[PDB]
Amino acid sequence: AAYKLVLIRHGESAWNLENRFSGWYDADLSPAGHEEAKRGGQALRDAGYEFDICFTSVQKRAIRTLWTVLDAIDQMWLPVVRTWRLNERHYGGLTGLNKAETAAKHGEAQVKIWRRSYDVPPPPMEPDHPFYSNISKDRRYADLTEDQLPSCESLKDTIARALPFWNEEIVPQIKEGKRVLIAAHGNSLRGIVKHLEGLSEEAIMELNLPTGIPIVYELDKNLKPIKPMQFLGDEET
Amino acid sequence: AYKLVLIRHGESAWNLENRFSGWYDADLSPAGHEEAKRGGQALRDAGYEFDICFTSVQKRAIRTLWTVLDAIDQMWLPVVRTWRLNERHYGGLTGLNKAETAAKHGEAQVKIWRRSYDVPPPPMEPDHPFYSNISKDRRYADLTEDQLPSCESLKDTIARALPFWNEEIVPQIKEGKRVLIAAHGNSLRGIVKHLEGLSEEAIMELNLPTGIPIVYELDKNLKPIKPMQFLGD
Ligand SMILES: Cc1ccc(S(=O)(=O)Nc2cc3c(c(O)c2O)C(=O)c2ccccc2C3=O)cc1
Ligand SMILES: [Cl-]
């Protein structure tokens, strides 16, 4: 096809192991999640992939995934662009809580409701929240307006703030002929995939992208996929 | 009262920093990487914050930067890479050790090269083991014919580094952005010579330490207000 686009979702974080809600909390990769990034990188290397520009979030689990991939394909010299708009979904007041704490405080019914909803956000991260200053006062978000910096996000919100970056910064690069690599998170990449494929809310909520696996799109000049997304790796993976 | 930080990368693999590594894309050795970690460590201990980073397109410099951002927990910073901050291109000498260089060219000519600001080594010819590896590398594909060197005098190196300094780095500093530059001995020589107004002789005698944060305090004219300070224990 005219264009080729590659996505990669970061693997396991240190908080995944604690089964806590990370969201915008900047958890690093676990050793195993770092190895996942190494395997992805290796798959891209074995297939001879070349990029011209890379996009990632401002969260280190994604950024470190990118670094690991560039290292494996010997393209550390590529231009890299970071943006909060590709950050994981903001889980608001749930941030820092584990599974038990969440069901204990809110009940199974309510957590099931948050889980299955496209457009209901979790509770806001208020100023007395233990990670409030850690996230909302981090200088990396200093250029954000009041309306841009979320206290919490529905999946709809996450996608809504990811897609402007896609349209305004990545899309022109692709049409300029640049080969793009995006290293980001489950839900921001869900935003990109929902847009590319014209998926429904129902469909996108049932889509779980695998972690650490290069995801390959073949796009026409209008950035319409010409075939289903392909996963890159050995046969078992 | 601007604050500027420079860092020169440490040891590269296979003793290449003692073999005119130049534009060959040598990685850090484990030890050069540990030097970078110590630098990062010192910057963290002093509570340094940056807003933007500049580096070359050579992986030993880039990995040095990565190691530093990792240690100071600022992996989210914007990073700009440029060939103009590359190491000096040592032409046909690239990859050769001291003995091989003297064997091939004689002590007289090597002494003349060591001491010249403006005499380049011989060009890297098609029979050099790194010729296609470097000249056909995709990262330089947009460089014009005159821009991609076959060899460089120190003068050449500085001449192509300073335009990036003036056009890209200077406006950031004047905006108050706190800049970190992770690069190479001779490109950082270019910057230091411009800042301090050094003579050719002085800049040729200046050997910046590796893996150590080098700190500048600049006035409203980007003129240093005191000598460079080294950061560490
Ligand atoms: C931190 C954490 C706790 C519990 C789980 S789970 O075993 O129940 N699997 C799981 C859970 C959720 C979710 C999920 O996809 C899932 O696989 C959600 O998407 C979700 C969205 C909004 C609020 C809560 C959830 C949610 O709890 C996963 C992660
Ligand atoms: Cl980077």
Swiss-Prot record, chain A:
The keyword Acetylation applies. SMART domains: PGAM. Its EC number is 5.4.2.11, 5.4.2.4. The active site is at H10, E88. The record marks H185 as: Transition state stabilizer. The keyword Isomerase applies. Signal peptide: none annotated. It is an enzyme of class 5 (isomerase). GO terms for molecular function: bisphosphoglycerate mutase activity; hydrolase activity; phosphoglycerate mutase activity; protein kinase binding. InterPro entries: His_Pase_superF_clade-1 (IPR013078), His_PPase_superfam (IPR029033), PG/BPGM_mutase_AS (IPR001345), Phosphogly_mut1 (IPR005952). Acetylation increases catalytic activity. Under glucose restriction SIRT1 levels dramatically increase and it deacetylates the enzyme. The modification Phosphotyrosine is found at Y25. One of its GO terms (biological process) is canonical glycolysis. The modification Phosphoserine is found at S13, S22, S30, S117. Substrate binds at residues 9-16, 22-23, 61, 88-91, 99, 115-116, 186-187. Pfam families: His_Phos_1. Expressed in the liver and brain. Not found in the muscle. Keywords: Acetylation, Glycolysis, Hydrolase, Isomerase, Phosphoprotein. The modification N6-acetyllysine is found at K105. GO terms for cellular component: cytoplasm; cytosol; extracellular exosome; extracellular region; ficolin-1-rich granule lumen; membrane; secretory granule lumen. It catalyses: (2R)-2-phosphoglycerate = (2R)-3-phosphoglycerate; (2R)-3-phospho-glyceroyl phosphate = (2R)-2,3-bisphosphoglycerate + H(+). It comes from the Eukaryota. Belongs to the phosphoglycerate mutase family. BPG-dependent PGAM subfamily. Homodimer. This is Phosphoglycerate mutase 1. It comes from Homo sapiens (Human).
